[model samples]
Target: AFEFKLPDIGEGIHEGEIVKWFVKPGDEVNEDDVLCEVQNDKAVVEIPSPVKGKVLEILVPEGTVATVGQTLITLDAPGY
Candidate 1:
Protein backbone atom coordinates (compact mmCIF):
# COMPACT_ATOMS: atom_id res chain seq x y z
CA ALA A 1 0.00 0.00 0.00
CA PHE A 2 1.10 3.53 -0.74
CA GLU A 3 0.15 6.60 1.16
CA PHE A 4 -0.47 9.52 -1.12
CA LYS A 5 0.78 12.75 0.36
CA LEU A 6 -0.26 16.25 -0.53
CA PRO A 7 2.71 17.79 -2.24
CA ASP A 8 3.51 21.46 -2.33
CA ILE A 9 1.50 23.03 -5.09
CA GLY A 10 2.55 26.62 -4.75
CA GLU A 11 4.93 28.92 -3.03
CA GLY A 12 3.97 29.90 0.51
CA ILE A 13 1.02 27.53 0.51
CA HIS A 14 0.98 25.07 3.35
CA GLU A 15 -2.65 24.12 3.72
CA GLY A 16 -5.79 24.00 1.65
CA GLU A 17 -9.41 22.98 1.87
CA ILE A 18 -10.43 20.00 -0.15
CA VAL A 19 -12.82 21.34 -2.74
CA LYS A 20 -13.94 18.15 -4.45
CA TRP A 21 -12.74 14.64 -5.06
CA PHE A 22 -12.71 13.12 -8.50
CA VAL A 23 -12.02 9.64 -7.17
CA LYS A 24 -13.09 7.78 -4.08
CA PRO A 25 -12.19 4.65 -2.19
CA GLY A 26 -12.00 1.59 -4.44
CA ASP A 27 -11.76 3.75 -7.53
CA GLU A 28 -9.10 2.80 -10.02
CA VAL A 29 -6.88 5.66 -11.12
CA ASN A 30 -4.03 6.20 -13.52
CA GLU A 31 -0.96 8.38 -13.29
CA ASP A 32 -1.61 12.07 -13.94
CA ASP A 33 -5.37 11.69 -13.43
CA VAL A 34 -7.17 14.27 -11.40
CA LEU A 35 -7.74 13.05 -7.86
CA CYS A 36 -9.16 16.10 -6.22
CA GLU A 37 -9.09 19.86 -6.04
CA VAL A 38 -7.93 22.01 -3.16
CA GLN A 39 -8.48 25.67 -2.51
CA ASN A 40 -6.02 27.89 -0.76
CA ASP A 41 -4.59 31.36 -0.86
CA LYS A 42 -7.22 32.59 -3.25
CA ALA A 43 -6.63 29.73 -5.62
CA VAL A 44 -8.06 26.34 -6.50
CA VAL A 45 -5.49 23.77 -7.47
CA GLU A 46 -6.22 20.40 -8.99
CA ILE A 47 -4.45 17.52 -7.35
CA PRO A 48 -3.33 14.66 -9.55
CA SER A 49 -2.25 11.08 -8.99
CA PRO A 50 1.43 10.26 -9.16
CA VAL A 51 0.95 6.55 -9.74
CA LYS A 52 -1.55 4.10 -11.17
CA GLY A 53 -3.45 2.40 -8.40
CA LYS A 54 -6.75 1.71 -6.71
CA VAL A 55 -7.80 4.12 -4.00
CA LEU A 56 -7.92 2.30 -0.67
CA GLU A 57 -8.86 5.09 1.67
CA ILE A 58 -9.53 8.79 1.58
CA LEU A 59 -8.01 10.42 4.64
CA VAL A 60 -9.44 13.87 4.09
CA PRO A 61 -13.05 14.62 3.31
CA GLU A 62 -14.15 17.36 0.99
CA GLY A 63 -14.53 20.82 2.57
CA THR A 64 -11.78 19.97 5.05
CA VAL A 65 -8.36 21.52 5.04
CA ALA A 66 -5.06 19.65 5.16
CA THR A 67 -1.44 20.67 5.31
CA VAL A 68 1.23 19.83 2.82
CA GLY A 69 3.13 16.55 3.37
CA GLN A 70 0.05 15.01 4.98
CA THR A 71 -1.36 11.80 3.68
CA LEU A 72 -4.45 12.35 1.56
CA ILE A 73 -5.26 8.82 0.50
CA THR A 74 -4.04 5.27 0.71
CA LEU A 75 -3.56 3.39 -2.53
CA ASP A 76 -2.64 -0.06 -3.74
CA ALA A 77 0.09 0.51 -6.26
CA PRO A 78 0.91 -2.60 -8.27
CA GLY A 79 4.65 -2.37 -8.69
CA TYR A 80 5.69 -1.68 -5.15
Candidate 2:
Protein backbone atom coordinates (compact mmCIF):
# COMPACT_ATOMS: atom_id res chain seq x y z
CA ALA A 1 0.00 0.00 0.00
CA PHE A 2 1.13 3.50 -0.78
CA GLU A 3 -0.06 6.73 0.71
CA PHE A 4 0.12 9.84 -1.39
CA LYS A 5 0.26 12.89 0.80
CA LEU A 6 -0.58 16.48 0.09
CA PRO A 7 2.71 18.29 -0.04
CA ASP A 8 3.44 21.93 0.41
CA ILE A 9 3.43 22.72 -3.29
CA GLY A 10 4.01 26.39 -2.82
CA GLU A 11 6.02 28.45 -0.45
CA GLY A 12 4.25 29.03 2.86
CA ILE A 13 1.44 26.71 1.77
CA HIS A 14 0.19 24.71 4.70
CA GLU A 15 -3.25 23.74 3.47
CA GLY A 16 -5.38 23.52 0.35
CA GLU A 17 -8.91 22.85 -0.80
CA ILE A 18 -9.53 19.88 -3.07
CA VAL A 19 -10.81 21.57 -6.19
CA LYS A 20 -11.27 18.49 -8.35
CA TRP A 21 -10.32 14.86 -8.76
CA PHE A 22 -8.96 13.31 -11.92
CA VAL A 23 -9.14 9.84 -10.44
CA LYS A 24 -11.22 7.72 -8.09
CA PRO A 25 -11.06 4.56 -6.05
CA GLY A 26 -10.16 1.47 -8.11
CA ASP A 27 -8.75 3.62 -10.87
CA GLU A 28 -5.38 2.62 -12.33
CA VAL A 29 -2.82 5.37 -12.18
CA ASN A 30 0.74 5.95 -13.32
CA GLU A 31 3.50 8.03 -11.91
CA ASP A 32 3.07 11.70 -12.79
CA ASP A 33 -0.60 11.19 -13.56
CA VAL A 34 -2.73 13.96 -12.15
CA LEU A 35 -4.68 12.79 -9.15
CA CYS A 36 -6.48 15.96 -8.17
CA GLU A 37 -6.48 19.70 -8.26
CA VAL A 38 -5.91 21.70 -5.11
CA GLN A 39 -6.56 25.36 -4.54
CA ASN A 40 -4.29 27.13 -2.13
CA ASP A 41 -4.04 30.82 -1.31
CA LYS A 42 -1.60 31.38 -4.14
CA ALA A 43 -2.81 29.17 -6.98
CA VAL A 44 -4.50 26.02 -8.08
CA VAL A 45 -2.08 23.09 -8.21
CA GLU A 46 -2.32 19.67 -9.74
CA ILE A 47 -1.40 16.79 -7.47
CA PRO A 48 0.23 13.79 -9.15
CA SER A 49 0.35 10.13 -8.36
CA PRO A 50 3.73 9.00 -7.17
CA VAL A 51 3.29 5.34 -7.91
CA LYS A 52 1.83 3.30 -10.73
CA GLY A 53 -0.93 1.08 -9.43
CA LYS A 54 -4.60 0.78 -8.60
CA VAL A 55 -6.03 3.45 -6.37
CA LEU A 56 -7.27 1.90 -3.18
CA GLU A 57 -8.96 4.90 -1.60
CA ILE A 58 -9.42 8.60 -1.64
CA LEU A 59 -8.77 10.10 1.78
CA VAL A 60 -10.15 13.52 0.87
CA PRO A 61 -13.19 14.40 -1.18
CA GLU A 62 -13.73 17.29 -3.49
CA GLY A 63 -14.22 20.67 -1.80
CA THR A 64 -12.49 19.31 1.29
CA VAL A 65 -9.57 21.05 2.85
CA ALA A 66 -6.40 19.12 3.73
CA THR A 67 -3.18 20.05 5.42
CA VAL A 68 0.34 19.59 4.12
CA GLY A 69 1.76 16.08 4.60
CA GLN A 70 -1.75 14.65 5.04
CA THR A 71 -2.55 11.49 3.16
CA LEU A 72 -4.74 12.36 0.22
CA ILE A 73 -4.99 8.99 -1.44
CA THR A 74 -3.91 5.39 -1.06
CA LEU A 75 -2.77 2.96 -3.74
CA ASP A 76 -1.97 -0.69 -4.09
CA ALA A 77 1.44 -0.68 -5.70
CA PRO A 78 3.15 -3.99 -6.01
CA GLY A 79 6.67 -2.97 -6.95
CA TYR A 80 6.85 0.59 -5.77
Candidate 3:
Protein backbone atom coordinates (compact mmCIF):
# COMPACT_ATOMS: atom_id res chain seq x y z
CA ALA A 1 0.00 0.00 0.00
CA PHE A 2 2.75 2.41 -0.85
CA GLU A 3 0.60 4.36 -3.23
CA PHE A 4 -2.84 5.36 -2.00
CA LYS A 5 -5.62 7.26 -3.64
CA LEU A 6 -8.80 9.24 -3.02
CA PRO A 7 -11.04 6.24 -2.73
CA ASP A 8 -14.80 6.31 -3.10
CA ILE A 9 -15.67 7.14 0.43
CA GLY A 10 -19.15 8.19 -0.60
CA GLU A 11 -20.95 5.92 -2.99
CA GLY A 12 -18.39 6.09 -5.78
CA ILE A 13 -19.07 9.77 -6.10
CA HIS A 14 -17.31 12.16 -8.42
CA GLU A 15 -13.99 13.70 -7.52
CA GLY A 16 -14.06 15.62 -4.27
CA GLU A 17 -12.59 19.00 -3.44
CA ILE A 18 -9.04 19.05 -2.10
CA VAL A 19 -9.12 20.42 1.39
CA LYS A 20 -6.14 22.18 2.88
CA TRP A 21 -3.24 19.76 3.31
CA PHE A 22 -1.46 19.01 6.55
CA VAL A 23 1.74 17.73 4.88
CA LYS A 24 3.62 18.78 1.77
CA PRO A 25 6.26 17.56 -0.65
CA GLY A 26 9.42 16.19 1.02
CA ASP A 27 7.45 15.70 4.24
CA GLU A 28 7.67 12.45 6.16
CA VAL A 29 4.50 10.47 6.80
CA ASN A 30 3.25 7.08 7.97
CA GLU A 31 0.37 4.66 7.70
CA ASP A 32 -1.80 6.40 10.24
CA ASP A 33 -0.56 9.86 9.39
CA VAL A 34 -3.05 12.41 8.22
CA LEU A 35 -2.05 13.55 4.77
CA CYS A 36 -4.90 15.98 4.43
CA GLU A 37 -8.61 16.48 4.20
CA VAL A 38 -11.20 16.16 1.46
CA GLN A 39 -14.81 17.18 1.10
CA ASN A 40 -17.16 14.83 -0.67
CA ASP A 41 -20.61 16.30 -1.00
CA LYS A 42 -20.06 18.45 2.06
CA ALA A 43 -18.59 15.63 4.08
CA VAL A 44 -15.34 16.77 5.65
CA VAL A 45 -13.30 13.58 5.27
CA GLU A 46 -9.76 12.95 6.39
CA ILE A 47 -7.37 10.81 4.37
CA PRO A 48 -4.39 8.76 5.51
CA SER A 49 -1.03 7.61 4.16
CA PRO A 50 -0.51 3.99 3.29
CA VAL A 51 2.78 3.42 5.10
CA LYS A 52 5.98 5.04 6.23
CA GLY A 53 6.76 7.16 3.24
CA LYS A 54 8.27 10.55 2.80
CA VAL A 55 6.23 12.20 0.11
CA LEU A 56 8.08 12.96 -3.09
CA GLU A 57 5.44 15.28 -4.50
CA ILE A 58 1.76 15.99 -4.76
CA LEU A 59 -0.31 14.88 -7.72
CA VAL A 60 -3.70 16.53 -7.30
CA PRO A 61 -3.00 19.14 -4.69
CA GLU A 62 -2.97 21.74 -7.37
CA GLY A 63 -5.89 22.44 -9.71
CA THR A 64 -6.86 19.02 -11.01
CA VAL A 65 -9.31 16.18 -10.71
CA ALA A 66 -9.06 14.08 -7.54
CA THR A 67 -11.31 11.29 -8.55
CA VAL A 68 -11.56 7.81 -7.11
CA GLY A 69 -8.56 5.55 -7.80
CA GLN A 70 -6.40 8.59 -8.62
CA THR A 71 -2.92 8.59 -7.14
CA LEU A 72 -2.67 11.04 -4.30
CA ILE A 73 1.03 11.39 -3.65
CA THR A 74 4.36 10.13 -4.91
CA LEU A 75 5.63 8.29 -1.88
CA ASP A 76 9.21 7.23 -1.27
CA ALA A 77 8.21 4.20 0.80
CA PRO A 78 7.88 1.02 -1.18
CA GLY A 79 7.48 -2.77 -0.91
CA TYR A 80 8.67 -4.33 2.27
Candidate 4:
Protein backbone atom coordinates (compact mmCIF):
# COMPACT_ATOMS: atom_id res chain seq x y z
CA ALA A 1 0.00 0.00 0.00
CA PHE A 2 1.04 3.55 -0.65
CA GLU A 3 0.30 6.63 1.34
CA PHE A 4 -0.47 9.63 -0.84
CA LYS A 5 0.54 12.66 1.14
CA LEU A 6 -0.12 16.31 0.48
CA PRO A 7 2.86 17.83 -1.21
CA ASP A 8 4.23 21.31 -1.49
CA ILE A 9 2.20 22.73 -4.36
CA GLY A 10 3.85 26.08 -4.62
CA GLU A 11 7.04 27.65 -3.46
CA GLY A 12 7.08 28.33 0.27
CA ILE A 13 3.41 27.55 0.69
CA HIS A 14 2.71 25.86 4.01
CA GLU A 15 -0.99 25.20 4.05
CA GLY A 16 -4.16 25.14 1.97
CA GLU A 17 -7.88 24.54 1.93
CA ILE A 18 -9.13 21.60 -0.05
CA VAL A 19 -11.17 22.92 -2.96
CA LYS A 20 -12.28 19.60 -4.45
CA TRP A 21 -11.52 15.93 -4.64
CA PHE A 22 -11.22 14.03 -7.89
CA VAL A 23 -10.98 10.52 -6.47
CA LYS A 24 -12.93 8.79 -3.76
CA PRO A 25 -12.33 5.71 -1.69
CA GLY A 26 -12.19 2.56 -3.79
CA ASP A 27 -11.69 4.50 -7.00
CA GLU A 28 -8.92 3.78 -9.47
CA VAL A 29 -6.45 6.52 -10.24
CA ASN A 30 -3.34 7.00 -12.30
CA GLU A 31 -0.01 8.59 -11.82
CA ASP A 32 -0.01 12.33 -12.46
CA ASP A 33 -3.81 12.47 -12.21
CA VAL A 34 -5.26 15.29 -10.20
CA LEU A 35 -6.39 13.69 -6.98
CA CYS A 36 -7.52 16.86 -5.32
CA GLU A 37 -7.53 20.62 -5.68
CA VAL A 38 -6.35 22.86 -2.91
CA GLN A 39 -6.47 26.59 -2.45
CA ASN A 40 -3.95 28.48 -0.45
CA ASP A 41 -4.78 31.99 0.63
CA LYS A 42 -3.15 33.07 -2.61
CA ALA A 43 -3.80 30.36 -5.21
CA VAL A 44 -5.50 27.15 -6.19
CA VAL A 45 -3.32 24.08 -6.50
CA GLU A 46 -3.89 20.70 -8.03
CA ILE A 47 -2.44 17.75 -6.11
CA PRO A 48 -1.54 14.84 -8.34
CA SER A 49 -0.85 11.19 -7.73
CA PRO A 50 2.66 9.85 -7.82
CA VAL A 51 1.77 6.35 -8.95
CA LYS A 52 -1.15 4.40 -10.42
CA GLY A 53 -3.37 2.58 -7.97
CA LYS A 54 -6.78 1.99 -6.46
CA VAL A 55 -7.66 4.41 -3.72
CA LEU A 56 -8.23 2.54 -0.51
CA GLU A 57 -9.19 5.55 1.54
CA ILE A 58 -9.20 9.31 1.64
CA LEU A 59 -7.97 10.74 4.92
CA VAL A 60 -9.31 14.23 4.30
CA PRO A 61 -12.56 15.50 2.84
CA GLU A 62 -13.41 18.41 0.62
CA GLY A 63 -13.27 21.88 2.12
CA THR A 64 -10.74 20.77 4.67
CA VAL A 65 -7.76 22.77 5.79
CA ALA A 66 -4.50 20.87 5.38
CA THR A 67 -0.85 21.37 5.98
CA VAL A 68 1.95 21.09 3.46
CA GLY A 69 2.90 17.62 4.61
CA GLN A 70 -0.12 15.52 5.44
CA THR A 71 -1.42 12.18 4.33
CA LEU A 72 -4.39 12.62 2.06
CA ILE A 73 -5.12 9.10 0.87
CA THR A 74 -4.00 5.51 1.05
CA LEU A 75 -3.52 3.65 -2.20
CA ASP A 76 -3.40 -0.08 -2.65
CA ALA A 77 -0.77 -0.18 -5.30
CA PRO A 78 1.18 -3.26 -4.35
CA GLY A 79 3.24 -3.23 -7.52
CA TYR A 80 4.25 0.37 -7.41
In model 3, state the lDDT of residue 78.
65
Pairs in clash, predicted candidate 3: none
Q: How many clashing residue pairs appear in each of the predictions shown?
A: 0, 0, 0, 0
Provide the global lDDT of candidate 3 against the true structure. Answer: 0.64
Write down the RMSD of all candidates, one decimal each: 3.4, 3.3, 3.5, 3.6
Error of 1 at 30 (Å): 2.1
Candidate that would win on lDDT: 1
lDDT string, candidate 4, 1-80, tens digits? 66544456545666557787766554777777774777766678776777877777776767777564676666777875
lDDT of each: 0.71, 0.70, 0.64, 0.67
Candidate 1, residue 22: the lDDT equals 71
RMSD of 2: 3.3
Candidate 2: tens digits of C-alpha lDDT, residues 1-80:
76554446544776668888866564777777874778877778776766678877777767788665777667788975
Model 4 residue 60 CA deviation in Å: 1.8
Once fitted onto the true fold, the runs of candidate 4 whose alpha carbons sit more than 4 angstroms away are 6-11, 68-70
TM-score attained by model 4: 0.64
Once superposed on the true structure, which residue ranges of model 3 sit more than 4 Å away at CA? 6-11, 62-64
Q: Write the per-residue lDDT of candidate 3 for residues 1-80, one digit (tens) a residue.
A: 45544446446565657767766564776668774667766567776655676777877784455665667666776666
Deviation of model 1 at 57, angstroms: 0.3
